[PDB]
Structure formats: C-alpha cells, structure tokens
Design a protein around this ligand. Structure first.
Ligand code: 2B1
Ligand code: 2B1
Lengths: 427, 428
C-alpha cells in the first residue's frame, strides 16, 4: 500500500480513537517508520522526520527500535511466541513478576498480568471487591475517587472517570454510581484532606476502595497535586479500613521523576495498576499488583480464586520486551536523566508564561504542560507543530509533551519551541 | 532462571487465571519452548515435547514459530514497532482492516481495533448502546443472550456470562442484570426460537442488542448448536429492532469449518467481535466490526464520537503478524484442511462413546469434545496425557481439543488417544 492507498482504506474502514466515522475534522497522517525519538510521517506526499514528543501516548520511554528491546523480542520469538497461562508458567513471566515486585512500592508481592490498562483497572476493582467478600463484608462494593480522574474506557473504569467534565460524562446514567470527592488542588491544603476523610467516613461501610491517579492526573487535565495528599489518603484508608488503589498506568517507570509516582510520598497502596511504559511501547501489556494480605484473603474466601484470566495472559513476547525495558531503565542513572529532561522542559517552556493565551506552565519530571485560556484547535496546532519538526497532539485547552527519555537537550529545545509557537498561535 | 527458580518465583508472585495464590494446589508446569504443534515442558526436571492439543486456547492455528509469521513480525519490527493511533494511521492497520472487511460476513464495513477479546466485547456493547442513543432511544440499554455463554472477564462482559454458571452467584448482585434465554439446544427445534422471540418481545423497548457465540459455545461448556438458530436470531432482531452481535472470538478464522461460524447460517450480524486466532496466537489483538448503518448512526448522533481508545490500539506489530496469519490461512485450501481434521477427530474419539463414564462425544470442524458424567480429576488426567506426549487441560466434566491446523493425521491420532485414555480413567 502507498500512503494514498492507506489514507483511502483508512477513511473507508478504520475507526480511530475517540472519533466519528466519516466526519472527523482532521484526516490521519500516514506514519511509515519510527526510530529513536523520531517518526517518519508523510506530508503532502513527502516523508518528513518529526520528534515523537508524546512518546506514542506515554509508551516509548526508550524511543522506538532500541537495539536492546528489538533483541529481547527477536530472542524470545526464536524460543516461544506464546503459551496459555492455565497450568503452565514460563521464564518471561517469572523474570517480569520478580522485577515488578522488587521495584514497586513495598509490600506489593503478587502480580496479575493482563492485556491493557483498562483491563488492569477492572482486575484491581475485582481484587478489591473479592477481598471484602472474602472478609464476609460484601456491602463494601462501591469505589471512591476525587474529581478530574480517568482510568480507561471499559464500563467499570468509566464509572470512576470525572462525571461532569470527563470524557464519559454522557454515560453516567448506565454506570455504577461511585463516590466523588472534589477536584484535588495543586497546593497542599489540610482542609481538603479533612473534607475527603469526612466524606469517606460517611460511606466507609459501603466502600471497597479509594482509587486515584497519584500526583499526576492525565486525561482529566494533566493536573499535578502535592504528594502529601497521598500520605493523607494512605492514613485515611488505613484508619477506615478502605483499600487504597493507585493507578500508575500513566505515571509509572520514571515518568514523574520518581520510579513510581507513589514514591514521591513514600506510600504503598494495597493494589496498583501499571501498563504503557511497562513494555517500552512495543506491545500491549498491563499488570495489577496487590499485597500478600489481599491475595490470601481473596484465596481463602468462598470463591477460593480470583475470577479472572485473559487469553493472552502473561504473553511471553510482551513479557520478554517488558523485562528488557525495565532492565534498560534500571541499568542507567534514570533519575539524573529525568531531572535533566525536566530542567530542559522548564527552561524551554518558560517564555510561554508571558503569552496572552497561556494561563499556566507546569512541569513534573518528564511531563511538560502549557495550559491555555481556550480549547486548542488541532487544525491549527497540528500543521504548526509539524512545520517545526514535532508531532504534538493537544487536547482540551492543553499543549503538552511527555518525551522519550533518550531525547537530547537539543531535541527537548526543539520540542519546547514547537509547543511555545503552538501556544502563540492559539492566542 | 532455571526451571526450579521459575517455580519458586511463580509460587511466590504470580497469579494464574482463575486461581489462588499459595493454595495451588499442583504447581504449574514450566514451558521452555514452543515450535509448530509442540510445546517443550519440564516434567520432573526433564524437558519433554508434547502436542498443543488446545492450540494455546484457540490461538495457535498455524502452530508456534511458523516461519511466515515470525518473518512478518521481524520485518515490521525493523521499520516501526508502534505509533499512537490518535491522528496517525499506518500500513499494517490498513492492510488488516481491508482483509477483515473482505472476509467477514457481508456488510461489516468498519473496524475498531482493541487489545483483547473482553475489550472488543465492551466496545461492541458501547456501539450498540450509543447506536440507540443516536436514534433517541436511550432506554434501549440492556443486553439479551442465551445461557451457556462466555464473553470474557471485565464487568460488562461478565454480565452476559452464563450465571448458573461460568462464574456467577458471587457477582450477580453487583453486575448489570441482563436478559437470559434458556440454554440453546444442540438439535434444531423451532419452538425454542419462538420462545426466545416471545421473551425478547416483552423486553424489546429496553434492549440494545442480542449477544451470542454463533454455533459453538466455548468456555461455558464446549457446546454446539444448530446454525439455523442464528438465522432465527437475525430475523427476530430485524423485526423487533434489536441489534445482533456475534462474538466470534473463539469460532473465527476457519475453526468450525467455515471462515466464520456465521457463514454456516449465511447471516450477518450488525456487530462482530474477533480475536485469538486473528494474530496466529503471537500477540494480543482483537477487533469489533460493525455495519455502515451502525457506524453512521453513532457518528450522526448528538454524542458524536465513540469515546474509546486503548493505548496500543491498532499496534503495528500485532497488526503485521495478523495480516500474515490471515493471508497464510486464505492462501491454502483451509476448508479441506479443517474437514480432514474433523475426520481425524471423529475417527479417534469414536472409541470413547462406549466408555462407562462418557455421556457424549461431539466434533465440529477442528474441535473435539468428550463429555463425562462427573468432574475430571486433573491429578489423574495430567500424568495420563503427558505420558502420551499431549498437553490436555480438562475442565468440569469435559475433555477437549482444538488442535493447530498444521497437525498431521498421526498427531491427531496421538491427541485423540490421549483424550480417550483420560475418559477411560474417569470411569474406573
Ligand atoms: C491512568 C490511566 N488509567 C487507565 C488507562 C487506560 O489504559 P488503556 O486506554 O486501556 O490502554 C489510562 C489510559 N490513558 N491513556 C491516556 N492517553 C492520553 C493521551 C493524551 C492525554 C492524556 C492521556 S491518558 C490511564 O491514563
Ligand atoms: C467467545 C469469547 N469471547 C470473549 C473472550 C474474552 O477474551 P479475552 O480472554 O479477554 O482475551 C473469550 C475468551 N475465551 N477464552 C477461552 N479459553 C478457553 C479455553 C478452553 C475452552 C474454552 C475456552 S474460551 C471468548 O471465548
């Protein structure tokens, strides 16, 4: 297929994410290659190199086509593509489980693999519900969260998306009714935590768990909060016997400047979800971790088992590339790498603060955000970014980047420049 | 890691499907390699080769490590591992979409990719509900199915599982309450369809869709039903204005002796789920296809867009290997291959019919089932199967195989002999 033929087939047959069929304002751009931090895209019938400023939706932390990951994949392919995980186990699953237990917050001792982020969220909810069922308290079946959150697109995940402003707002009438605290503020305010506790207390007997994105709320608005809130959440959940679940599908593997965002507060949740950067952006994989207590209570309950098990659970290929990606990250001074990226993002975005359409500029580890005073038009932003050698995808009123960790200083500069000029055009 | 170290790590840290932690019992067996129709497993420290009689749960239709599929994957790896599908498109996704639209039942014109069977089912439900909202009928929000079914493990997918039940009871009081018709029988009885219609009719104004596995019910009991029932469902759904969803995640890609099980009935659903054998069993990928009417009705509704988009949607690696898997299937006389497999399963499993513990023996395309009168003890069945060089995994009272399409007559003879032996051991 030529780029023209791809565009034709795509228009006729392919549904894109969060899109209509036949009435999308912008057509998709054909991608033809990816290497390191760079994508080869077709523009006006000509190939162009652009920086993957978004790391392919926060996955490609080591960039594309990294020799260590390519080889981990080809080596596993030579041995064993896949086998079912029912009654069988294998080396990639064992190596990965051991890595994930060792590097996640203390006490997360068990790993349930699944195929995607939304599934790992559903598994976390199932763990929480079965846990209380195992304690003979089946009335603890609701979830609590704060506003501004997002946890995926399957029906239980949607139930904890922000109900009046989140992407699943039109569905609230068919979703499980969960408990929502107000939007968590950026600055630490003890009064916020007190109000959260007072609200949780009213519902404790019907709550299985608090589920939140720690430190960084992504799809809900790339908002940052003070890590001390997580300390309060841990304290509150412990004192009211509510399980705490951290969804680290976006925040994991160094992105926020700590290995996991929970680490900014030194907090351990009872249950944790991971995905995205887990595989280095090669293949779909996610995991849900839980404590020995949670696992044993589920296992010693009336069910005797966790009632979940996906087809390609613990796929050897996906596990193998994930092992290599985690080892690649752990084997370098990743913390200094992220500190350097953050400094680059900070310095490069500083000049946006004075732009007339810009209401905030904020950086957290390798995440850079320009918040604008109006929704950003993709028909303007997309060409403008491409004209500057950068793939950027704004959403809502936000121009943002989460670059591969391999980006050089010059590359970060180029990314921040494109973002600044996008914000300038908005205004 | 050595196989002993794998076991140690596994026992401490790994959750297995529908299992416990620390309460096994019976450790899992270490798999160290897979090639063609064979797995290499560690039994008492010894590596042994055994037949993958279940195709690693329906997936490995061309066997493991097929040269054409390995090559397709490595070719794509060198060019582009993965890009975001938000505002970007690529050759593997386009190539695969065109193939799937061409080989599926008439009228399924648009493809939404996801990463697993359960997700594709959630996407199909969302399409159905959003369709009716786009017609100003938001009360059409429930699903209807028949008993014996399985559609995955996410909370919406659980709500249409057989309650009585694949894994209900514990949950029923937290799941969406769907409408269930009685177990669809093996043999065609027009009275069953009339009763299904009457039940549906009273719920029509609150129903978005009927969702069923066509011809073969997998995890819910490895049961088969006359394809004519699907013709009736198509008709009932048409007349009462309820969408029809076929979940072909297990039945797809030739398994039942037709390219898709719907083809046995010569009927097209409004929405269709595919997965598993899609990728030749290399990687997780699934797809939900719908008609032009479904897609446009969603897209013209005030809601507008379908708010769904998995991170790895339309992953180039997974799409690349799938293209190669589908082309490899289509470029051979697959129909004769399945007919021969059905023949070998029938001939091999014949012995079982006369066994004391055996209540049914049944074959449909490349699927063979021995049903027993009591649960099959794994402690007995496993060594018996392994002694015979075959990996089998009975569940409930069922001994079954869904072998790779590449299996030779000798291999089918080996597989069925292991099954007959397991059944023989049940009733003694
Ligand atoms: C915290 C959290 N939990 C669960 C999920 C769901 O993962 P999947 O969409 O099933 O792969 C996600 C997926 N989020 N993906 C995102 N993509 C973008 C893109 C632009 C801006 C924000 C986001 S969040 C998540 O962030
Ligand atoms: C019809 C149907 N729909 C959805 C799913 C869910 O797929 P995922 O497990 O989420 O990838 C499935 C998954 N089925 N897995 C099965 N494994 C076995 C194993 C032995 C016998 C039957 C089955 S069905 C399915 O069969």
């Amino acid at each position: 297929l030529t780029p023209e033929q791809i565009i034709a087939v795509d228009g006729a047959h392919l549904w894109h994410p969060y899109s209509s069929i036949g009435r999308e304002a912008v057509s998709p751009v054909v991608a033809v290659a990816a290497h390191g931090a760079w994508l080869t895209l077709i523009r006006d019938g000509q190939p162009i190199e652009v920086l993957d400023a978004m790391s392919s939706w926060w996955t490609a932390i080591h960039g594309h086509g990294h020799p260590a990951l390519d080889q981990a994949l080809t080596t596993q392919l030579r041995v064993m593509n896949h086998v079912m995980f029912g009654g069988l186990t294998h080396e990639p699953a064992a190596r990965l489980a051991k890595l994930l237990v060792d590097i996640t917050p203390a006490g997360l001792d068990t790993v349930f693999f699944s195929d995607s982020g939304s599934v790992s969220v559903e598994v976390a909810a199932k763990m929480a519900l079965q846990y209380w069922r195992g304690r003979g308290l089946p009335g603890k079946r609701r979830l609590m969260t704060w506003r501004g959150g997002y946890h995926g697109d399957t029906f239980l995940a949607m139930s904890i998306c922000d109900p009046h402003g989140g992407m699943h707002s039109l569905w609230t009438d068919v979703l499980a009714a969960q408990v929502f605290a107000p939007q968590v503020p950026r600055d630490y305010d003890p009064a916020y935590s007190a109000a959260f506790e007072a609200q949780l207390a009213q519902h404790a007997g019907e709550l299985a768990a608090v589920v939140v994105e720690p430190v960084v709320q992504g799809a809900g608005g790339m908002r940052f909060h003070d890590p001390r809130y997580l300390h309060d959440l841990r304290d509150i959940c412990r004192r009211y016997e509510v399980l705490l679940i951290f969804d680290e599908i976006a925040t994991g593997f160094g992105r926020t400047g700590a290995l996991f965002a929970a680490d900014h507060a030194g907090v351990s949740p009872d249950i944790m979800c991971v995905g995205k950067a887990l595989t280095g952006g090669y293949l779909s994989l996610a995991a849900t971790l839980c404590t020995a207590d949670v696992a044993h209570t589920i296992s010693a309950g009336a069910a005797g088992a966790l009632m979940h098990g996906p087809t390609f659970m613990a796929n050897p290929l996906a596990c193998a590339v994930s092992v290599a990606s985690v080892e690649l990250l752990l084997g370098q001074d990743w913390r200094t790498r992220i500190t350097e990226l953050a400094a680059g993002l900070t310095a490069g975005l500083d000049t946006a603060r004075a732009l007339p359409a810009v209401t905030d500029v904020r950086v957290c580890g390798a995440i850079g955000v320009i918040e604008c005073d109006r929704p950003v038009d993709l028909a303007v932003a997309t060409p403008a970014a491409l004209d500057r050698g950068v793939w950027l995808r704004p959403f809502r009123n936000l121009v943002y980047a989460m670059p591969p960790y391999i980006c050089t200083p010059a590359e970060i500069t180029q990314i921040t420049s494109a973002m600044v000029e996008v914000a300038r055009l908005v205004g």
